[PDB]
Design a protein around this motif. Structure first.
Motif, PDB file in Angstrom:
ATOM      1  N   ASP A   1      26.313  44.495  40.108  1.00  0.00           N
ATOM      2  CA  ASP A   1      26.946  43.135  40.771  1.00  0.00           C
ATOM      3  C   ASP A   1      27.383  43.473  42.017  1.00  0.00           C
ATOM      4  O   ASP A   1      28.608  44.599  42.253  1.00  0.00           O
ATOM      5  N   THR A   2      26.872  42.845  43.353  1.00  0.00           N
ATOM      6  CA  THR A   2      27.541  43.208  44.504  1.00  0.00           C
ATOM      7  C   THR A   2      28.910  43.060  44.578  1.00  0.00           C
ATOM      8  O   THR A   2      29.898  43.524  45.468  1.00  0.00           O
ATOM      9  N   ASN A   3      29.552  41.909  43.879  1.00  0.00           N
ATOM     10  CA  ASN A   3      30.766  41.458  43.654  1.00  0.00           C
ATOM     11  C   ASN A   3      31.705  42.764  43.359  1.00  0.00           C
ATOM     12  O   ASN A   3      32.949  42.865  43.805  1.00  0.00           O
ATOM     13  N   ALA A   4      31.246  43.788  42.569  1.00  0.00           N
ATOM     14  CA  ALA A   4      32.302  44.570  42.212  1.00  0.00           C
ATOM     15  C   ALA A   4      32.669  45.512  43.218  1.00  0.00           C
ATOM     16  O   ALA A   4      33.924  45.665  43.560  1.00  0.00           O
ATOM     17  N   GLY A   5      31.680  45.980  44.071  1.00  0.00           N
ATOM     18  CA  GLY A   5      31.968  46.764  45.145  1.00  0.00           C
ATOM     19  C   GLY A   5      32.651  46.100  46.489  1.00  0.00           C
ATOM     20  O   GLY A   5      33.564  46.686  47.128  1.00  0.00           O
ATOM     21  N   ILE A   6      32.390  44.811  46.608  1.00  0.00           N
ATOM     22  CA  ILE A   6      32.917  43.769  47.689  1.00  0.00           C
ATOM     23  C   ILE A   6      34.705  43.946  47.262  1.00  0.00           C
ATOM     24  O   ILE A   6      35.526  43.920  48.290  1.00  0.00           O
ATOM     25  N   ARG A   7      34.812  43.653  46.216  1.00  0.00           N
ATOM     26  CA  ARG A   7      36.220  43.514  45.739  1.00  0.00           C
ATOM     27  C   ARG A   7      36.911  44.804  45.696  1.00  0.00           C
ATOM     28  O   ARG A   7      38.069  44.699  46.415  1.00  0.00           O
ATOM     29  N   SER A   8      36.157  45.795  45.478  1.00  0.00           N
ATOM     30  CA  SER A   8      36.964  47.132  45.650  1.00  0.00           C
ATOM     31  C   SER A   8      37.257  47.427  46.936  1.00  0.00           C
ATOM     32  O   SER A   8      38.412  47.864  47.311  1.00  0.00           O
ATOM     33  N   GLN A   9      36.300  47.036  47.810  1.00  0.00           N
ATOM     34  CA  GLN A   9      36.368  47.237  49.294  1.00  0.00           C
ATOM     35  C   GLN A   9      37.599  46.560  49.885  1.00  0.00           C
ATOM     36  O   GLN A   9      38.441  46.972  50.733  1.00  0.00           O
ATOM     37  N   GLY A  10      37.778  45.162  49.468  1.00  0.00           N
ATOM     38  CA  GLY A  10      38.877  44.386  49.852  1.00  0.00           C
ATOM     39  C   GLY A  10      40.070  44.981  49.432  1.00  0.00           C
ATOM     40  O   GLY A  10      41.332  45.035  50.065  1.00  0.00           O
ATOM     41  N   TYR A  11      40.358  45.448  48.290  1.00  0.00           N
ATOM     42  CA  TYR A  11      41.510  46.012  47.483  1.00  0.00           C
ATOM     43  C   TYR A  11      41.875  47.086  48.488  1.00  0.00           C
ATOM     44  O   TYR A  11      43.019  47.369  48.932  1.00  0.00           O
ATOM     45  N   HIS A  12      40.919  48.043  49.037  1.00  0.00           N
ATOM     46  CA  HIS A  12      41.439  49.358  49.518  1.00  0.00           C
ATOM     47  C   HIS A  12      41.520  49.253  50.641  1.00  0.00           C
ATOM     48  O   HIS A  12      42.506  49.912  51.285  1.00  0.00           O
TER      49      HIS A  12
ATOM     50  N   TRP B   1      33.002  44.546  33.766  1.00  0.00           N
ATOM     51  CA  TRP B   1      33.410  43.351  33.454  1.00  0.00           C
ATOM     52  C   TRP B   1      33.599  43.151  31.948  1.00  0.00           C
ATOM     53  O   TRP B   1      33.207  41.869  31.384  1.00  0.00           O
ATOM     54  N   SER B   2      33.856  44.066  31.201  1.00  0.00           N
ATOM     55  CA  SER B   2      33.863  43.848  29.514  1.00  0.00           C
ATOM     56  C   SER B   2      35.528  44.215  29.266  1.00  0.00           C
ATOM     57  O   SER B   2      36.034  45.213  29.576  1.00  0.00           O
ATOM     58  N   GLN B   3      36.006  42.911  28.587  1.00  0.00           N
ATOM     59  CA  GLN B   3      37.412  43.054  28.014  1.00  0.00           C
ATOM     60  C   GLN B   3      37.469  44.378  27.037  1.00  0.00           C
ATOM     61  O   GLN B   3      38.407  45.301  27.311  1.00  0.00           O
ATOM     62  N   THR B   4      36.346  44.623  26.132  1.00  0.00           N
ATOM     63  CA  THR B   4      36.334  45.535  25.197  1.00  0.00           C
ATOM     64  C   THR B   4      36.289  46.794  25.846  1.00  0.00           C
ATOM     65  O   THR B   4      37.079  47.860  25.377  1.00  0.00           O
ATOM     66  N   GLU B   5      35.495  47.040  26.843  1.00  0.00           N
ATOM     67  CA  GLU B   5      35.371  48.382  27.624  1.00  0.00           C
ATOM     68  C   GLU B   5      36.538  48.715  28.448  1.00  0.00           C
ATOM     69  O   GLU B   5      36.977  49.775  28.667  1.00  0.00           O
ATOM     70  N   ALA B   6      37.310  47.572  29.024  1.00  0.00           N
ATOM     71  CA  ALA B   6      38.434  47.736  29.685  1.00  0.00           C
ATOM     72  C   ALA B   6      39.588  48.512  28.709  1.00  0.00           C
ATOM     73  O   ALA B   6      40.566  49.053  29.077  1.00  0.00           O
TER      74      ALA B   6
END
Ligand SMILES: OC[C@@]1(O)CO[C@H](O)[C@@H]1O
Ligand SMILES: [Ca+2]
Length: 287
Positions: free
Chosen positions: A137-148, A167-172
């Motif tokens: 999901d390209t959203n994962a990397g875009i958000r991480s880039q915005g954060y950093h 994107w998983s509650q149980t994995e998180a």
């Protein structure tokens, strides 16, 4: 006799996707369409099966929150070659001129808002953890880039783990337990989405670490409720309900007379959610 619109999202155990499905269904029926709502469970093969079903049922358009930016191109193109247009929401595909629309949130802008609030809550210092989304999901990397791009202005803030929980509650929850055991000297967690933030806050609470600051992304009712009760400190609203409805509006205009949006790719603004406006948030809309 009524025209059919197919609505395909990931599984409804993430409230974001359920809200998109219900918003799209509502708009479709308001405009006189029947609906066929399907879930692909983030499985590209299941997604391909569901698009085949939409084709076999004669859907006049597909509303899609896809199962992978690369993997989904072929299935969207299959529907297109069968004469069925697709209006994508939330997640982009890595191709232009295939979907008729890709209506997504401004993920970089929203991520910067969340990270700015995180920095403020952290007092510009301390060790933190980041939970990232699915690589597909390209959203994962875009958000991480915005954060950093925000956090790298604050030298006293240091990331001590950066791990995907898909994107998983149980994995998180499980990941956060492991990260916390290895890094007890953490002050905050910034998450790429709200289900992972829910898993993180629960793991932190179970460990007796309610002091740790958590910031999410999405604006779900679950994270809203955590904010209201003093748990998670902030999130970022993506206008999921309105985004799904806008896709159906564009689908309807296209079905009626082949009106196409001027630009295929479209952005919708995000808004920070914290204790001061959580009480105005309901089902991914502020009032
Ligand atoms: O939780 C919904 C998401 O944040 C995760 O998958 C997609 O990127 C959504 O925007
Ligand atoms: Ca910077």
């Amino acid at each position: 006799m009524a025209d059919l619109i197919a609505i395909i999202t990931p599984a409804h155990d993430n409230p974001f996707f359920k809200a998109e499905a219900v918003g799209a269904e509502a708009k479709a029926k308001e405009l006189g369409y029947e609906t066929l709502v399907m879930t692909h469970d983030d499985d590209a093969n299941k997604q391909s099966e569901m698009i085949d079903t939409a084709i076999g049922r004669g859907a006049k358009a597909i509303i899609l929150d896809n199962a992978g930016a690369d993997a989904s191109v072929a299935a969207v193109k299959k529907a297109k070659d069968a004469g069925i247009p697709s209006f994508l929401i939330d997640r982009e595909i890595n191709a232009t001129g295939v979907a008729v629309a890709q209506i997504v949130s401004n993920n970089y802008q929203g991520a910067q808002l969340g990270a700015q609030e995180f920095v403020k809550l952290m007092g510009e210092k301390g060790n933190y953890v980041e939970l990232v989304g699915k690589e597909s999901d390209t959203n994962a990397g875009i958000r991480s880039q915005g954060y950093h791009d925000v956090i790298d202005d604050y030298p006293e803030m240091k990331s001590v783990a950066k791990q995907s929980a898909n994107w998983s509650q149980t994995e998180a929850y499980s990941k956060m337990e492991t990260i916390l055991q290895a890094n007890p000297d953490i002050k905050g967690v910034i998450s790429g989405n709200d289900t992972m933030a829910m898993g993180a806050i629960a793991a932190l609470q179970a460990a007796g670490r309610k002091d740790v600051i958590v910031v999410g992304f999405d604006g779900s009712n679950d994270v809203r409720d955590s904010i209201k009760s003093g748990g998670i400190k902030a999130t970022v609203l993506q206008p999921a309900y309105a985004q799904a409805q806008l896709a159906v509006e564009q689908a309807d205009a296209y079905i009626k007379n082949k009106t196409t949006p001027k630009e295929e790719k479209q952005l919708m603004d995000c808004v920070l959610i914290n204790a001061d406006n959580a009480g105005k948030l309901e089902t991914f809309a502020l009032t």
